[PDB]
Design a protein around this ligand. Structure first.
Ligand SMILES: [Co+2]
Ligand SMILES: [Co+2]
Lengths: 489, 489
């Protein structure tokens, strides 16, 4: 039904405006403009929501007569989203929405001082609303499964728990072998001017063939990807003078997200089937490019001579030394700084906590002690204060629960996708040659072209023939880190 | 009525989004994003219009009971705007809106080739709609008076004609005395790197105390000022390597607009009384700062040492030489490049043409010949082609008629405002000292604080005690250009 399509395409225009408003907020917006910008965003978002849970859309959904298979998926997906969100009493939406912004802005102030008490009351409030929200969305097995479903449709906390446990056991085994070894000096531990870093990030984006007719690179406090409109998908990075790896891998990570957004069929734009399949799947794409491609020796062989030219200071290092040095493993307090071996331990910890929070088995008051205890259990670290501890990430302070686990699933999806890719393609030759269109074409045909037509579990089977599990990841880490650290396992 | 205020403040949020969408379009937007951005903008604009011509607002306007004098003005102004635009059949709005964008985009292509025929059909169409638009808005004296009223409320074409004639006569007299003199070499006719130009524009903005917590400077193809939101008023400039005066005076011109927007009372934000009084009044503010302040010897005395430091190449010039050189008079094809003596001749020519167009006394087909004839009559120039001729400006190709004359009125207002300011203030001492808050305070108390509470004719009397006329301008030009060129008159 053309009429159904138009209704969605009209609402998407308001989403586009909201997306630009968010992008500008993080990049160019003047300081004092913040509070009003927040009000504009809230207004536009709430209007878009009204439109998307309105009777006229339900009426269109119930009257449309699909002609093709794609039309069927559209209504199917359209219906499921509509009836789920119809159930949301506009009171609860606005009550969460304002509580979020207020928790968000309070967190900014309290975080440098690890002052949990300044954010505690709003956090225990947002968790309460979430639990009510979860009740009136309905759930199988666990209240938490309701919220998890919003980010990873069809995924259950019990399966996540089973995969996480196996993943954890393998990671402690690996960590223990790696930790025995003396570390080498870090060749990237040195000052490289921002201008040189920008030059290299821009070179990388051209080498990867980022479409600068349909996006751009800017800086923000926290690197992200923002699909603003048709042919407008923007990415940000951050330049840390004494660790060029931050800008390099942020840029490539965001390229990964951007490529996904740009490669979804144009005809899907603005439609319910027009986004990525899930947060896990979107993160599988950023991680694929950032880590599987970006931290591979094959990738480095191709960028080495250009890097060396731009950064003559590091001429004295071999490509193999540089490759190993972007793969340094280290238990650290900060999730966003974690290597691909320790990273998932950070997600497990957050998974355990937010699940118990939403299932009413843990209080907000006990969060700091619980966080610290789990960092001690899984990462063997003594969290000194809350800044490095439980207030380090914004997610919870924006009210997002069920989001965190999808970062880990993203790592798992990426490894399994990569194992499949390797059956059809000489990955090392392709990547060291810089011939990425071969890889892009595989990802488009297998993944990007499907948009949100399928739930992730179905999508992973279509792509790889198997449900998601940890074996691909285990194999990926065993093989790679054995080569990195020159030891068995 | 708080309820009336809220309704407007809600619509203003959509205006805010539209404003950001326009700003980004001109600054950061990737090339291929254009067509969809145009669709988002159109959608949001049309929704905002619906809201502002909707029965619920009429009902609020007719039921509100003003408590204070400001409330009265609000409803008064609110009513006049509402009933005027209610009369607009949504067909006519969208029909003009799309015709505009299509005329706009065609013009871009045809302009480099002066191909009038590629734009002719859409232009004759947009003029026809305009004439219908003018009929169903209603008018006194002239159909053109309807459109003129949208940019300069209460102004009639007959008064504009009378002022323009006197202004023209004085200008040819002045031009003739100036043209007899041999020109000196132009000290600014040299390459100055963009980095140095940026440094100076940023210095200027700090010297003028642009509030960078509530705005920012960027570049675009065509310098402008965009009030995006509360505490968010942005300006753009353009750097021409071989004429630093372009960036200097663009920056200061836009500062002038920005200051006006920022100084309207916060309580008026989002309300009908919350904008500038008219286009003429807004342009009087940009011109005041750009020319009356910016091209004065007094201003130059204060910026001289800083300029000289930034541009050591021009150390060999005296401040008086630099001052004269930003005041070089020259008949030229291009309106945006015209000095303050010849500039208004460009506006007269456009006034005469669009008035006759809208009053049905001139066809679109005859525009090129008419333009060329009037450039010959008033500026003594032989227009070689349409690129330098009638297709040089975008206004008509965006459907804006009645806009052009307000540029000239802006010059007239500025001179009269300046004559009044001089009765209360030692302008030269204040300006050469860099003590601009004295001037800002006068402009705020007299002008900016009034927003759109008053029609321009009433506002100019309040500010200066007289209706608008050309005498202040005549006096301003006689006195200044006599000093610049060292001759009588
Ligand atoms: Co990501
Ligand atoms: Co202006």
């Amino acid at each position: 039904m053309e009429e159904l399509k138009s209704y969605y395409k009209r609402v998407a225009k308001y989403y586009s405006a909201a997306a630009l408003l968010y992008w500008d907020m993080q990049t160019y917006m003047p300081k004092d403009a913040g509070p009003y910008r927040a009000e504009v965003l809230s207004e536009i978002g709430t209007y878009a929501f009204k439109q998307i849970t309105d009777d006229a859309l339900g009426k269109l959904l119930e009257t449309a007569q699909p002609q093709s298979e794609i039309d069927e998926k559209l209504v199917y997906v359209g219906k499921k989203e509509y009836y789920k969100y119809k159930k949301v009493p506009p009171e609860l939406f606005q009550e969460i929405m304002i509580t979020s912004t207020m928790l968000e802005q309070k967190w900014e102030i309290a975080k440098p001082r690890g002052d949990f008490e300044e954010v505690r009351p709003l956090l225990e409030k947002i968790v309460d609303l979430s639990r009510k929200y979860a009740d009136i969305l309905g759930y199988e097995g666990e209240p938490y499964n309701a919220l998890l479903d919003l980010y990873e449709p069809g995924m259950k906390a019990e399966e996540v728990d089973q995969i996480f446990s196996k993943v954890r056991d393998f990671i402690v085994e690996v960590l223990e072998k790696i930790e025995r070894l003396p570390k080498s000096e870090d060749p990237f531990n040195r000052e490289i001017g921002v201008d040189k870093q920008k030059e290299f990030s821009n070179w990388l984006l051209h080498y990867l063939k980022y479409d600068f007719t349909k996006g751009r690179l800017d800086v923000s406090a926290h690197p992200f990807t923002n699909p603003i409109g048709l042919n407008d998908v923007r990415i940000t990075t951050r330049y840390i003078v004494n660790d060029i790896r931050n800008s390099i891998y942020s840029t490539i990570h965001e390229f990964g997200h951007a490529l996904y957004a740009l490669s979804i069929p144009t005809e899907f734009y603005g439609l319910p089937i027009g986004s990525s399949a899930s947060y896990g799947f979107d993160e599988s794409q950023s991680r694929f490019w950032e880590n599987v491609v970006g931290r591979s020796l094959a990738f480095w062989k191709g960028i080495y001579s250009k890097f060396i030219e731009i950064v003559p200071e590091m001429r004295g290092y071999s490509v193999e030394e540089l490759w190993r040095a972007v793969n340094r493993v280290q238990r650290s307090f900060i999730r966003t700084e974690a290597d691909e071996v320790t990273y998932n331990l950070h997600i497990i910890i957050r998974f355990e906590i937010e699940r118990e929070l939403i299932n009413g088995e843990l209080s907000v008051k006990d969060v700091p002690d619980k966080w610290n205890e789990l960092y001690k259990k899984y990462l063997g670290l003594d969290v000194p204060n809350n800044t490095l501890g439980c207030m380090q990430d914004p997610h919870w302070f924006g009210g997002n629960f069920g989001y965190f686990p999808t970062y880990a699933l993203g790592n798992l999806y990426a490894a399994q996708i990569f194992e499949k890719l390797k059956e059809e393609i000489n990955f090392e030759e392709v990547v060291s040659a810089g011939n990425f269109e071969i890889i892009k074409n595989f990802l488009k045909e297998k993944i990007h072209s499907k948009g949100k037509m399928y739930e992730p579990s179905d999508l992973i089977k279509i792509v790889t023939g198997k449900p998601l599990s940890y074996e691909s990841f285990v194999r990926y880490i065993k093989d790679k880190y054995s080569k990195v650290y020159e030891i068995e396992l």
